[PDB]
Write a protein that binds this ligand. Structure first.
Ligand code: HEM
Length: 154
């Protein structure tokens, strides 16, 4: 699929706001994901044990991963679609080492959209959400094709 420059603009305009606090958005998003879809916390051998949202908020490791994953996503979105190089090592490690099904990438895309909507209502109206959703669907479709080339999930 292909986004128009206008759509990339809306995505990078609200992302510039997220970047003012990467560790805070990374936490919110992961907690939203784990509270909504608790089965996803099982994939993390380092935090699996956390039982509550308070314990999640206080975990430094969880916050460190939030910064790690969000930074990578930000580096992919900034490419505006030209992200083949970036995707390769990510698809390999999520398909062979972590084993993250496409369905989970859809769950975290819903978490990203829930948090941006909460924190940035003004910069995340309907058109800006439609664009963000398109950019994440583009990210999932390319990762899913790479997963098939790599022998995973199919
Ligand atoms: C927006 C999509 C996502 C991005 C950009 C992303 C990015 C990353 C990055 C950069 C790392 C570190 C390097 C590596 O191992 O590849 C990582 C590790 C990891 N990611 Fe993902 N990720 C995404 C979605 C997910 C989801 C949905 C899950 C699980 C339900 C997941 C599970 C993990 C796990 C288990 C590790 C290892 C963490 C630790 O042991 O240090 N990722 N991810």
């Amino acid at each position: 699929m292909v986004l128009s420059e206008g759509e990339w603009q809306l995505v990078l305009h609200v992302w510039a706001k997220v970047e003012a606090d990467v560790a805070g958005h990374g936490q919110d998003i992961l907690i939203r994901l784990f509270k909504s879809h608790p089965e996803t916390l099982e994939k993390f051998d380092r935090f699996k044990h956390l039982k509550t949202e308070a314990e999640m908020k206080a975990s430094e490791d969880l916050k460190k991963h939030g910064v790690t994953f969000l930074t990578a996503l930000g580096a992919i979105l900034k490419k505006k679609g030209h992200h083949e190089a970036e995707l390769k090592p990510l698809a390999q490690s999520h398909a062979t080492k972590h084993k993250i099904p496409i369905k989970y990438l859809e769950f975290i895309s819903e978490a990203i959209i829930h948090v941006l909507h909460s924190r940035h209502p003004g910069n995340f109206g309907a058109d800006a959400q439609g664009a963000m959703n398109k950019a994440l669907e583009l990210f999932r479709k390319d990762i899913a094709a790479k997963y098939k080339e790599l022998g995973y999930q199919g």
